[PDB]
Amino acid sequence: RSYQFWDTQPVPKLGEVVNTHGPVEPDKDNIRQEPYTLPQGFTWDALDLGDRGVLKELYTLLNENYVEDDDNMFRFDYSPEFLLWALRPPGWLPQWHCGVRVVSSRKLVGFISAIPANIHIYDTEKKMVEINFLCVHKKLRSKRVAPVLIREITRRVHLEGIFQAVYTAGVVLPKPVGTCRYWHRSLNPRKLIEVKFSHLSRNMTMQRTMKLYRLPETPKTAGLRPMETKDIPVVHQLLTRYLKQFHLTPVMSQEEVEHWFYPQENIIDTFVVENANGEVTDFLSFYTLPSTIMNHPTHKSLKAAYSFYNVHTQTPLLDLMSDALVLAKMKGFDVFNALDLMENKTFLEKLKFGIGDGNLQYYLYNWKCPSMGAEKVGLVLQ
Numbered sequence: 286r287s288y289q290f291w292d293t294q295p296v297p298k299l300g301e302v303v304n305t306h307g308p309v310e311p312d313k314d315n316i317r318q319e320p321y322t323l324p325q326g327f328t329w330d331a332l333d334l335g336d337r338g339v340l341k342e343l344y345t346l347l348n349e350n351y352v353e354d355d356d357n358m359f360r361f362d363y364s365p366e367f368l369l370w371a372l373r374p375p376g377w378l379p380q381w382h383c384g385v386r387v388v389s390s391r392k393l394v395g396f397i398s399a400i401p402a403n404i405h406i407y408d409t410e411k412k413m414v415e416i417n418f419l420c421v422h423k424k425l426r427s428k429r430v431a432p433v434l435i436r437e438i439t440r441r442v443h444l445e446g447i448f449q450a451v452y453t454a455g456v457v458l459p460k461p462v463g464t465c466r467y468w469h470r471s472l473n474p475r476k477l478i479e480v481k482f483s484h485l486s487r488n489m490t491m492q493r494t495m496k497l498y499r500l501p502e503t504p505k506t507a508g509l510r511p512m513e514t515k516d517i518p519v520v521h522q523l524l525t526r527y528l529k530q531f532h533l534t535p536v537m538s539q540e541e542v543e544h545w546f547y548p549q550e551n552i553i554d555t556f557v558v559e560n561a562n563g564e565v566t567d568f569l570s571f572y573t574l575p576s577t578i579m580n581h582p583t584h585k586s587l588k589a590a591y592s593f594y595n596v597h598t599q600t601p602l603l604d605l606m607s608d609a610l611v612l613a614k615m616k617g618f619d620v621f622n623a624l625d626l627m628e629n630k631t632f633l634e635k636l637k638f639g640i641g642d643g644n645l646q647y648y649l650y651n652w653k654c655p656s657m658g659a660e661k662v663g664l665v666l667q
């Protein structure tokens with residue numbers, strides 16, 4: 286195969302085994318000062334997401350044009366407040382919220398974003414960025430706009446002295462460092478079958494299916510409660526120690542832990558286990574991301590929870606995740622999603638998760654290293 290754009294980039298070749306660890310090319314000593322040229326009629330615009338009007342414009346772009354399933358039945362519906370959470374973590378930069386507008390109408394038609402992240406990859410910690418929310422309006426697809434967005438964000442990141450990035454995609458590109466699979470745990474099977482997210486199993490009736498997926502009304506783990514301000518330091522401690530066992534992980538400051546885990550209704554939930562001694566020994570977390578159900582007369586949205594980071598030191602992981610499912614059901618979610626990364630394969634089948642269609646590929650930009658199994662991936666992106 287051939288990749289017109291990706292073959293020009295500092296990434297390894299598909300199907301070539303890597304034995305070394307390091308950058309594909311050295312750091313650049315001079316960087317292009319001018320933005321890359323867009324097709325006539327379009328212009329760059331940095332989006333100030335602290336402006337209500339601009340945030341809503343981005344919401345609308347993504348709501349109408351972002352990731353869909355293969356059958357064009359579901360589309361991610363990131364809320365404006367979720368977008369602020371995902372795009373303004375500690376160290377965020379305005380120039381890294383990179384929009385494309387039509388010059389005449391001002392209509393937002395493209396976006397790409399970078400946020401800073403310290404990333405541990407095997408035996409090296411690098412300052413990187415995480416690239417997310419790459420989106421081109423449906424009416425502009427297949428016109429090679431994506432490569433311009435990627436090159437422009439690369440340039441803007443280079444200006445800040447950063448030369449590596451991490452990103453995920455549902456498509457195969459040169460060259461995945463890890464390959465994960467989505468799994469889904471039905472919470473509201475009647476709705477999920479009705480909207481054709483799932484189907485009735487061959488030998489199962491609806492009644493049997495509702496029975497199969499039924500959950501306790503309240504969590505069972507002793508001392509489980511929502512994370513509070515006082516828990517920030519211990520959650521940071523727990524996470525840092527837990528992540529050591531994997532080969533691709535974030536390295537979060539205490540300020541970053543506060544940002545990513547402190548509960549915000551309809552965005553991020555974190556529950557800690559505070560034991561009989563008053564010690565926090567475990568935590569679970571999941572984020573809120575609904576999908577629009579396209580072309581349906583009565584069901585308009587699928588409420589999905591996504592497993593984030595789950596740390597166990599005294600509570601079995603199986604128990605923690607059982608409680609995450611119950612909590613998600615209580616909060617009105619239709620489905621609970623998780624990847625087969627970290628120690629997740631240890632609970633997925635047992636807790637009645639079903640395997641999904643889509644893969645999620647993990648990539649590094651300008652870093653060559655051996656690929657890893659899903660269980661060694663310890664990084665979750667929004």
Ligand SMILES: CCCCCCCCCCCCCC(=O)SCCNC(=O)CCNC(=O)[C@@H](O)C(C)(C)COP(=O)(O)OP(=O)(O)OC[C@H]1O[C@@H](n2cnc3c(N)ncnc32)[C@H](O)[C@@H]1OP(=O)(O)O
Nearest residue numbers: 288289290291352418419420421426427428429430431448
């Ligand atoms: C040091 C700092 C570095 C910073 C940069 C790090 C790298 C960041 C990399 C980006 C990480 C993004 C992380 C996320 O946000 S992944 C989420 C991507 N977004 C969506 O799926 C939303 C709905 N889809 C769209 O908007 C798409 O049609 C997009 C915008 C993706 C492509 O628009 P379009 O359909 O109109 O195509 P084109 O004619 O303009 O361009 C075709 C070229 O684009 C390559 N392509 C297609 N999809 C992806 C993809 N998901 N990652 C990387 N490359 C992709 C494709 O192979 C081809 O290259 P090649 O085969 O000829 O070589």
Ligand SMILES: Cc1nn(C)c(C)c1NS(=O)(=O)c1c(Cl)cc(-c2ccnc(N3CCNCC3)c2)cc1Cl
Nearest residue numbers: 352353354359360361453454455467576641643667
């Ligand atoms: C319910 C639903 N709604 N939507 C929109 C879909 C596709 C489903 N079905 S799904 O659960 O089984 C699922 C899900 Cl959630 C997500 C992806 C996927 C694909 C490509 N890219 C990403 N990224 C997300 C993280 N950052 C950028 C890359 C995700 C694929 C599948 Cl197939």
